[PDB]
Amino acid sequence: PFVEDWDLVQTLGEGSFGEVQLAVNRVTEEAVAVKIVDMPENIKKEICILKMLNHENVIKFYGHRREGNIQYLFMELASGGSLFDRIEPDIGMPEPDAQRFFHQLMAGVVYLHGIGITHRDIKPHNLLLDERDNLKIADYSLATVFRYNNRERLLNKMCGTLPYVAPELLKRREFHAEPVDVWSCGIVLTAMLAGELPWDQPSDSCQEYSDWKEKKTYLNPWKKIDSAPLALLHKILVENPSARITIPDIKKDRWYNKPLK
């Protein structure tokens, strides 16, 4: 029935593990986002995490259907598109829009981490907008459990997107999940405020990453950023994950608490 219930109108994007399509129902014309996977059982894990999600700043999971070898995952379509499309290259966006999206990103991330889930691929492509421009964290294909029965487990898989990835994930055999998601959030904030990513990756072979470690914020992208948010970015984009600021402390930051417009 699926082909008789739903029409796949277009490609929306690809997750790390899969591809998702705009689907419109042939009776109701209801429009949804559908992820279709040809069935290895990473998907079983993805589904199970998707079933846990209940928050305003996380995408809405409708449910799943398995037909043939193929699995179907249905989710709320984000009528606002992705955050990536609100970033003007070389410019970013107005500082108050950035702050609001960053407040919302932090709300979603706090939520995930409080259920012991790490997203592992936070970037503007995976941050979607509803009709009222409320941000929603999407794509749980790399998400995983880092805390269960109140015990933390360290991660050891490299994954994500290079320019968003924390430097410890390139160097350490094992590392803590939360500080890696905090890192990526800082790269997203950079992108929102400067319309460009600071480095290809956070390794010593990368000159722009060295420049930042030497504190040369007279260079781009940093020179485009006002002093208050830059001060936050200095706390987030700290190489040593154990000195990196934590989300509770982000919520006390000066710019984070600045009334804007």
Ligand X SMILES: CN1CCN(c2ccc(OCc3ccccc3)c(C(=O)Nc3cccnc3)c2)CC1
Catalytic residues: 121
165 touches ligand X (CB under 6 A): no
* Binds ligand X by CB under 6 A, chosen from 20, 93, 117, 180: 20
Restricting to residues 29-68, which ones interact with ligand X according to CB under 6 A? 33, 59
Residue nearest to ligand X (CB): 13
If binding means CB under 6 A, how many residues of this protein chain bind ligand X? 18
* Binds ligand X by CB under 6 A, chosen from 53, 138, 182, 185: 138
Say how far apart CA 97 and CA 57 lie, in whole Å: 16
Task: Give all strands (DSSP E) within 93-244, no chain letters.
Answer: 117-118, 127-129, 135-137, 144-145, 147-148, 151-152
Concatenated DSSP letters of 161-181: -GGGS-HHHHH-SSB-HHHHH
* Binds ligand X by CB under 6 A, chosen from 128, 165, 177, 237: 128
Burial 70-90 (b: 16+ CB within 10 A, else e): ebbbbbbbbebebbeebbeee
Report, in Å, the least distance between residue 222 CB and ligand X. Answer: 28
107 touches ligand X (CB under 6 A): no
Stretch that binds ligand X, among 120-128, 231-239, 241-249, 252-260 (CB under 6 A): 120-128
* Residue 165 backbone dihedrals phi, psi, to 5 degrees: -85, 140
Say how far apart CA 20 and CA 27 lie, in whole Å: 21
Stretch that binds ligand X, among 7-15, 36-44, 161-169, 186-194 (CB under 6 A): 7-15
Restricting to residues 65-104, which ones interact with ligand X according to CB under 6 A? 75-79, 81-82
Report, in Å, the least distance between residue 138 CB and ligand X. Answer: 4
Say how far apart CA 88 and CA 195 lie, in whole Å: 6
Q: Which of 25, 23, 29, 27 is nearest to 8 (CA)?
A: 23
The type of residue at 13 is G
Residues that bind ligand X (CB under 6 A): 12-13, 15, 20, 33, 59, 75-79, 81-82, 125-126, 128, 138-139
